[PDB]
Design a protein around this ligand. Sequence first.
Ligand SMILES: CCCCCCCCCCCCCCCCC[C@@H](O)O[C@H](CO[C@H](O)CCCCCCCCCCCCCCC)COP(=O)(O)OCC[N+](C)(C)C
Ligand SMILES: CCCCCCCCCCCCCCCCC[C@@H](O)O[C@H](CO[C@H](O)CCCCCCCCCCCCCCC)COP(=O)(O)OCC[N+](C)(C)C
Ligand SMILES: CCCCCCCC/C=C\CCCCCCCC(=O)O[C@H](COC(=O)CCCCCCC/C=C/CCCCCCCC)COP(=O)(O)OCCN
Ligand SMILES: CCCCCCCC/C=C\CCCCCCCC(=O)O[C@H](COC(=O)CCCCCCC/C=C/CCCCCCCC)COP(=O)(O)OCCN
Ligand code: SF4
Lengths: 49, 99, 59, 70, 129, 83, 156, 303, 98
Amino acid sequence: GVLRLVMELSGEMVRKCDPHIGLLHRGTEKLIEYKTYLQALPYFDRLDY
Amino acid sequence: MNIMLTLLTNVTLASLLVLIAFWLPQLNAYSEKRLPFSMKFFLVAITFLLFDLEIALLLPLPWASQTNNLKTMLTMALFLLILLAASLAYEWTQKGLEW
Amino acid sequence: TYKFVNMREPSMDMKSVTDRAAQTLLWTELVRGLGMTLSYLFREPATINYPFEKGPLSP
Amino acid sequence: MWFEILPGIAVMAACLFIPGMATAHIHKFTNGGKEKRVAHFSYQWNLMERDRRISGVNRYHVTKGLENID
Amino acid sequence: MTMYIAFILSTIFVIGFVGFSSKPSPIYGGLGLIVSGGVGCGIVLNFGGSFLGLMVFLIYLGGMLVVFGYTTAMATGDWVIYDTGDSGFFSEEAMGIAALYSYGTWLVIVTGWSLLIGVVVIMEITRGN
Amino acid sequence: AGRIASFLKNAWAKEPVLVASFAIGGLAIILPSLSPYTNYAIRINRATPYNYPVPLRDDGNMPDVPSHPQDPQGPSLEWLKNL
Amino acid sequence: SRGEYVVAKLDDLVNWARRSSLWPMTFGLACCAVEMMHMAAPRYDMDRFGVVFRASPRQSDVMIVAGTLTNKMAPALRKVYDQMPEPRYVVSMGSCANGGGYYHYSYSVVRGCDRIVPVDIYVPGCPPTAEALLYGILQLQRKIKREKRLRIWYRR
Amino acid sequence: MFMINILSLIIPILLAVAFLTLVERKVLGYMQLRKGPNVVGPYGLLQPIADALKLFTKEPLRPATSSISMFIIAPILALSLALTMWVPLPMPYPLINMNLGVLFMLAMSSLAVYSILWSGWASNSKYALIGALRAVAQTISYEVTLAIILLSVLLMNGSYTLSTLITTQEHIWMIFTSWPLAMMWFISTLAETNRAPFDLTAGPFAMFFMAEYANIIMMNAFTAILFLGASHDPHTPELYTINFVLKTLALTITFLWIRASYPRFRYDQLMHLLWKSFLPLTLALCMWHISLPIMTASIPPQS
Amino acid sequence: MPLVYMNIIMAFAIALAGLLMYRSHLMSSLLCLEGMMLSLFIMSTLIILNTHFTLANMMPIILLVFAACEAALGLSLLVMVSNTYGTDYVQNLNLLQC
Ligand SMILES: CCCCCCCCCCCCCCCCC[C@@H](O)O[C@H](CO[C@H](O)CCCCCCCCCCCCCCC)COP(=O)(O)OCC[N+](C)(C)C
Ligand SMILES: CCCCCCCCCCCCCCCCC[C@@H](O)O[C@H](CO[C@H](O)CCCCCCCCCCCCCCC)COP(=O)(O)OCC[N+](C)(C)C
Ligand SMILES: CCCCCCCC/C=C\CCCCCCCC(=O)O[C@H](COC(=O)CCCCCCC/C=C/CCCCCCCC)COP(=O)(O)OCCN
Ligand SMILES: CCCCCCCC/C=C\CCCCCCCC(=O)O[C@H](COC(=O)CCCCCCC/C=C/CCCCCCCC)COP(=O)(O)OCCN
Ligand code: SF4
């Protein structure tokens, strides 16, 4: 998918790994609050697609 | 003369093709808008250099086999190979081949 | 009911050790994978000839 | 099917045919219908030089047989 | 006579040495040294030293100057003196070089010892601490 | 006795490349001293004429020096032919 | 005359070469990426059209935006687009990339990727079938075939 | 007519490396239950030409700050070395008949790393420089074992002349005399050309690609001549040419097969592979192949 | 003595002077050392081949190998110095003085 990953290396070995997420934050949970339950069903298809 | 002409032709062809590649799309108008220094890489380069020197010593072996002194040549040739092996083993056991 | 995926113990007799050594030195499983890819080349591809052929749909 | 890979391979094969074959024919053409003489070790070169001197046409491959012994 | 091709090659050798001896931008100095090494290999080959010229070209260029470039990137009258006879059905340079294993036993021993000691020495120098 | 066999069996596992390397190198060192053909190799090398055989001046005191290549005196290469 | 005939034929040749080898890099942002991988799967085999699978940005001819573009992601997509060599084309895949889609009224979603980059082909669907994306790629090929650069230069 | 011979060596090689892309795509596709290109050209046959034209009509992205000198030099050196390495080879008769042809090819291959070093240096990037250093280290590491294996094999040939390899294998192939050395040689030639499972890394890009594919084909031809000796009849060399070409094509298709069959190593894993498995066996078998002709009185003629 | 020997000797002298100049960049010092070695190899090979002195064909190879080993050593030293200062400038090596 889409992922940003900021890490610190000492030569070959990985010392620290900090993933940055939110590049696919669509705000599904706030959008669900404006739909009926039926209307909010299709968001779950798009969650883990 | 034949080898010189061959290299000249190869180099000329490569240069011509690279320059036409770099200049054919330059004629049309377009928009036209650190420190780390790993020691392991240096050590592997140095190990390659030393093993390359020992290979250079090994190289005359195909001609060395017609000497009438076959025993001495075999001993010395074997000695060099054994010598090369020791370098590999010493570097191995001293953690010289790690990452 | 549960299953174990990686709970096998290699045999330590001389013949089994020799078999594993032959696998290491002669690359038997690599040749096996090459063999599957070769076999798999000799069968019909799954590609359809779009746009002259179309994927199946339903009402 | 798989035999549709054969055309491109064939083309590639034909290209790899061209160099070696060409060399052979050129070695026939510049050497009077014989393989180009090999000259290692400088005794072979001396043989070629003697041939070139005794040809009478400054060409090593013009071979002189017993008809030239008089 | 090709206007003293050996002299031309020697002049290019000297010019390349003048080029990289000014020591500009050590990568450029290394490049000048590579060109000079190629020219010197050409000199030796044209002279008749096929094996020794190829040793220059392989060992020197392909290993040693390659390691120099690696480390750098990590950081911030002729024709007359010649002989008359031939060599036989062998090349004299090859026979002399191959005599290393039958005649030069002492040279082999000292060279192998020096190379092993050099491996050990590089290990110890770069150990650090 | 037991320790060496156990060590060799434990090395044949998990280190077969090193066992093979050491076996091959050891055989390369040992066998030439025991082969009966190495003297044949030395003799074949001695039998290859790279230089011209410079004739000797006869003084009436060389019975073993041939006067012609076809003469029986001198070294022979029947052993080479039969090899 | 021959002056316009030669540029017409040479333009035809250049257009054929450009469209018969389209190398895309894909922004697999979301679940339209699954359908583009299904377009590279054996059944459709995009490679058989000359369209290679997963080209690098520095040798990419076309960009396929497949998924939702969020505000956090927009600068990266514009940066990637700028890097691409010209001539470059953009295919917008799915509702999210076309106009925001099912997240159009969101505080964190770009309402259409064409606010950020120009778009040549809009492939509709949620998601478009792999066959629909193939139809869109072939439509982009026909669009490339229609263009005529040498004539414009000769007539200007 | 020497210029015609040079051209008839250079041009067909470039056509072969152009159509090797087609063959690779077609072979990988069919091993993947699909096809390769089959739309551009009657059987995909015009795909390489379309690729070349598209690449040559695309904007070149000069780094705008990097060393333009080395930026232009690197592809020149790469392609020049790639085309030069074909001259020594005897198919059956060599364009240039060198006494030390094998050593010459070794020296050319050794030079082939300067292009990687310069392209990495002139990218004006720390990450690309890291990748270039990794590539150079892998290349030099594996050319070590290439050289040692090569001299061990040549000890049965009697010289460095590549033509004599045809004479040595008049009755039997060299693959039967030393298959372990041939196995390690094949893996080392995979790792030398940066081919999977060792693939850890507009115009000039195509130039680099041409150089790499020419090196692939030349390395496989060298393997064929070294280990798979065709029979050569002096009154009809075309039989040798066809046999040698068929063997070279088989080895190149085997490279494609291997790329399609396996995952790729890590850097440290392939470094350990070389330095801890190939080098010990290579030294041991070099000792063995030095001892073998003397023990059995089978030393090759030439001195 | 012909002009080829003169040119090789002149190249050696130029490399020696360049080493003795020390503008900066100890790597350039090592480069000058190895240019001296290359000139030495070339001229020794020319002399040995010209006089047909067969057993001395051994000598150039030996020289090469030994000198290359020295380069390795020198490189190591350079590297270590950089690890202390971050760069290989000549003027960093002034801790010890007369
Ligand atoms: C004598 C006292 C020794 C004790 C002191 C020890 C000090 C250091 C030891 C190192 C000295 C080594 C001496 C060997 C001298 C070499 C010459 C001599 O041995 O004769 C040769 C005999 O060769 C022998 O085979 C040499 C074998 C020695 C090499 C094997 C082991 C060497 C190890 C030495 C130390 C190296 C590093 C440490 C390793 C543990 C010549 O052979 P030959 O063919 O008749 O003559 C050639 C001339 N022709 C062509 C005209 C015919
Ligand atoms: C020796 C000197 C060489 C110098 C460089 C020249 C480059 C090499 C020359 C060879 C080029 C090959 C041209 C191949 C074009 C034929 C392709 C043909 O099949 O396309 C069809 C014909 O379309 C066009 O009519 C083709 C126009 C191509 C150019 C026409 C003439 C150009 C000649 C000018 C060359 C002179 C160059 C001047 C400067 C070098 C349409 O098919 P397409 O739409 O794709 O596919 C649709 C998919 N379907 C069919 C399966 C449903
Ligand atoms: C009586 C006297 C006889 C003389 C002695 C002869 C005895 C010989 C017996 C042993 C010889 C075998 C040596 C052959 C090569 C061995 C090297 C080796 O085994 O290395 C492997 C690794 O080898 C590889 O895996 C490399 C594979 C890379 C992928 C390439 C796939 C290639 C396979 C397809 C077939 C290739 C065909 C090669 C021959 C081509 C001919 C031109 C070991 O590494 P690891 O298993 O990871 O563990 C080591 C740490 N304990
Ligand atoms: C005496 C003959 C001399 C000539 C032969 C040698 C030629 C080349 C072989 C030598 C190459 C150098 C080898 C260097 C040795 C270092 C070994 C080592 O350090 O590995 C150890 C362990 O290896 C060992 O066990 C040490 C050697 C073990 C013995 C190997 C074989 C010894 C003899 C076997 C056969 C003997 C003769 C054959 C008998 C059969 C009849 C012929 C740790 O392995 P790692 O990968 O670092 O860590 C693993 C965890 N990550
Ligand atoms: S456009 Fe539709 S199918 Fe594609 S990621 Fe968005 S919601 Fe899913």
